[PDB]
Swiss-Prot record:
This is Double-stranded RNA-specific editase 1. It comes from Rattus norvegicus (Rat). Changing residue 55 to A: Reduced RNA editing activity. Residues 5-71 form the DRBM domain. Changing residue 11 to A: Strongly reduced RNA editing activity. It is found in: Nucleus; Nucleus, Nucleolus. The gene is Adarb1.
Amino acid sequence: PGPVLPKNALMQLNEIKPGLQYMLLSQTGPVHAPLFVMSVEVNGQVFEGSGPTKKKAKLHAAEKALRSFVQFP
């Protein structure tokens, strides 16, 4: 489904695997930007992606999770 989750990536993996499990590992950053990391779990393994917002962190994670799983890297 979509577009109500960070459109292109989230829709890509929501279709491909409508059953991922996202965890937020902690908000920090370079003092002039926040930075969040999400680990997203796709099959038995968690895939980690970093974003200056938790919604971009999970996008990064989930984007790679399915991309890596379909093609590599």
